[PDB]
Structure 1
């Protein structure tokens, strides 16, 4: 008789899911830019769990970091409402489910997926031509034309397509002066150098030098009650830092940050990540959902499974003897929402 999970349970589960997801991507695609929204992915899977049953359902909840018998829908609704409050970042998310029109959808799923997660389901004919354009145009519309041509290919024994895209360009609480921006070398690796517009700013920032993990941590507050936590590893050993990237480590960092005079150098960069959720969540124990035989009877009585699941996230960033924070080599970052502590984005900039 497990009642609705607490907000604190959701915070723990999503954050564990966030870091385990990064850890997988960092080993899947090394030496590559990483950028994704863990909370967005958690929400999409939680939404699908509305129509999931049996082992299909169990794998999702446990994969998300919850008990098998947990009730997560009340908590997620409240979380999403809080994240999408007017004083927040006002993230525009393309959150849609596309299923074969020949399949009758349960109105309970349609109601709950929209009411609890603001997800929109659609019945479409899945011929590769018209279907791809229809979905891509919708995603483009939902993201104010920022994310175009999301789907590149599409089989046509395709019965169910999950789409989840988000573009983010926030405003700093303390902006960079363009007169202090200067072109500098960004050292991608030992043999590769990229010229970047290096923004600079001298002032008070919450900052911490991690002796143990050999990295610098700095907090950059956004307008909208969120902040970017930038993690700059010392020379070499970015891999060792990634191995230590845990909810525990994050918590230690947040307690260790002190407001200090810092000389900050941050490059202007635009990065993105595009992920096949089938292959990524495969290593997270969520397998049945993406294969035929899945139990999605809560969505439709006809047999159904997720044919394709795509997540894409795009990010644009544009006394006495103070510490220097110069990000002219690959670095990690998180975007954390202040009120809930929710991890909105995780990323790594290798190629700016």
Structure 2
């Protein structure tokens, strides 16, 4: 559970994440989305830490933290970052690294290096893009080591090679409160579009889950608690195989509350795609839209508290995440509700794009927002030699 200052920041980060999600969903190039509100927030907090004047004020403004003091903002976000581990088993089902890359010519201020590592646990490194292959190799190897291989490649190309490159590498694996059986796994087809279908491995389970079927808006919503009901995962999926654009319009902080209230603990037969979903986002373009125009502009940016000198702007903000869907979770006692309690269950068969949200139960803060559109897999051909 959170302090009042951190709780208010948590709510604003949740706003930024939905605002970014909607902004990214509109981009037709974006397929999967995976945002971690508190890690997005800490990127803005890092700008207010190593910035001066309108560059740092815009960072506090995007955080709606103009009333809070500078040290208060850095401690509140710092409390938020430590609270992510609180309902996630640190270093085994949740790994996170944050590193700032500056050109070889630049040297970071020891005052900034101390306070960024203190609150944001930020790492600092220099990188020269003359050898572009060795610059990408240094970033990708760092993110791979941070996630112990789950996120092998953050990016295949760096566009802006003359500023600060903030990189956030993550690995999160939701640990179910009632585990799926390790053998209730088979191969199915996931329909990306009505025409394109990829071969995926799926995990299946039937249990009691809070569920709502919106027959009017043609969608299903299920909540799947995680280990010790300390956090819970919600999934919103349309009835037909359709683009999530329609469903995304309905996705609001208020509509979610409505849907949540309409749920009831029914027997549901859930089938989810099993595997790792690797997603990298360069939030630079989208952060400018939310009100961070100075830091991202080479000429307006003042990042003197960071390098003791100007000629340094926020070139990129990579938000790379490896989200693993696996069967593992806490065990459940057999003859808890009896096999006659799951007699005729509702069908939540996730074989087409869906939206999902992880939420902290002790603090109420949003842990993740995202959507699975194209899971990892090769297009399976139109066989249809029925079973």
Do Structure 1 and Structure 2 share a fold, with TM-score over 0.5? yes
Instruction: Say if 1:334 and 1:345, in contact at 8 Å, map to a contact too.
Output: yes
Residue of structure 1 in register with 2:119 after alignment: 116
Is 1:330 the counterpart of 2:350 in the alignment? no
The structural deviation recorded for 1:284 is: 1.9
In 2, Cα distance between the equivalents of 1:244 and 1:341?
21
Residue of structure 1 in register with 2:371 after alignment: 348
Instruction: Say if 2:160 and 2:315, in contact at 8 Å, map to a contact too.
Output: no
Q: 1:253 to 1:6 in 2, by over 3 A?
A: farther
Q: 1:137 to 1:31 in 2, by over 3 A?
A: closer
Unaligned 5+ runs, structure 1: none
Unaligned 5+ runs, structure 2: 327-340, 376-387
Give CA deviations for 1:95-114 in whole Å, capped at 9, x if unaligned.
10122343343322112111
Residue of structure 1 in register with 2:239 after alignment: 234
Residue of structure 1 in register with 2:66 after alignment: 68
Residue of structure 2 in register with 1:204 after alignment: 208
Residue of structure 1 in register with 2:58 after alignment: 59
Give CA deviations for 1:108-142 in whole Å, capped at 9, x if unaligned.
21121111111112345554344433333222222
Aligned-residue CA RMSD in angstroms?
2.6
Instruction: Say if 1:233 and 1:241, in contact at 8 Å, map to a contact too.
Output: yes
The structural deviation recorded for 1:16 is: 0.7
In 2, Cα distance between the equivalents of 1:103 and 1:238?
44
Q: 1:10 to 1:211 in 2, by over 3 A?
A: farther
Instruction: Say if 2:38 and 2:77, in contact at 8 Å, map to a contact too.
Output: no
Is 1:80 the counterpart of 2:81 in the alignment? yes
Q: 1:255 to 1:73 in 2, by over 3 A?
A: farther
Q: 1:325 to 1:89 in 2, by over 3 A?
A: farther
TM score, norm. by length of structure 2: 0.81
Is 1:136 the counterpart of 2:120 in the alignment? no
Q: Give 1:175's match in structure 2, choosing from 179, 196, 210.
A: 179
Q: Secondary structure at the match of 2:351?
A: coil
Instruction: Say if 1:210 and 1:216, in contact at 8 Å, map to a contact too.
Output: yes
In 1, Cα distance between the equivalents of 2:253 and 2:160?
41
In 2, Cα distance between the equivalents of 1:244 and 1:128?
47
Instruction: Say if 2:41 and 2:77, in contact at 8 Å, map to a contact too.
Output: no
Residue of structure 2 in register with 1:48 after alignment: 47
Deviates more, 1:25-34 or 1:154-163: 154-163
In 2, Cα distance between the equivalents of 1:210 and 1:282?
36
Q: Give 2:96's match in structure 1, choosing from 85, 93, 97.
A: 93
Q: Secondary structure at the match of 2:199?
A: strand
Deviates more, 1:42-51 or 1:221-230: 221-230
Q: 1:14 to 1:34 in 2, by over 3 A?
A: same
Q: Secondary structure at the match of 2:236?
A: strand
Give CA deviations for 1:122-174 in whole Å, capped at 9, x if unaligned.
34555434443333322222221222232433469623221111122232222
In 2, Cα distance between the equivalents of 1:36 and 1:111?
27
Deviates more, 1:85-94 or 1:311-320: 85-94
In 1, Cα distance between the equivalents of 2:109 and 2:225?
43
Residue of structure 2 in register with 1:252 after alignment: 258
The structural deviation recorded for 1:245 is: 1.3
Q: 1:144 to 1:53 in 2, by over 3 A?
A: same
The structural deviation recorded for 1:61 is: 2.5
The within-5 A match list for 1:268-307 is 268-292=274-298, 293-303=300-310, 304-307=312-315
Give CA deviations for 1:155-210 in whole Å, capped at 9, x if unaligned.
69623221111122232222222443343343222212233333221111122233
Instruction: Say if 2:268 and 2:348, in contact at 8 Å, map to a contact too.
Output: yes
Q: Secondary structure at the match of 1:47?
A: helix
Instruction: Say if 2:151 and 2:278, in contact at 8 Å, map to a contact too.
Output: no
In 2, Cα distance between the equivalents of 1:340 and 1:97?
29
The structural deviation recorded for 1:233 is: 1.7
Residue of structure 1 in register with 2:34 after alignment: 35
TM score, norm. by length of structure 1: 0.88
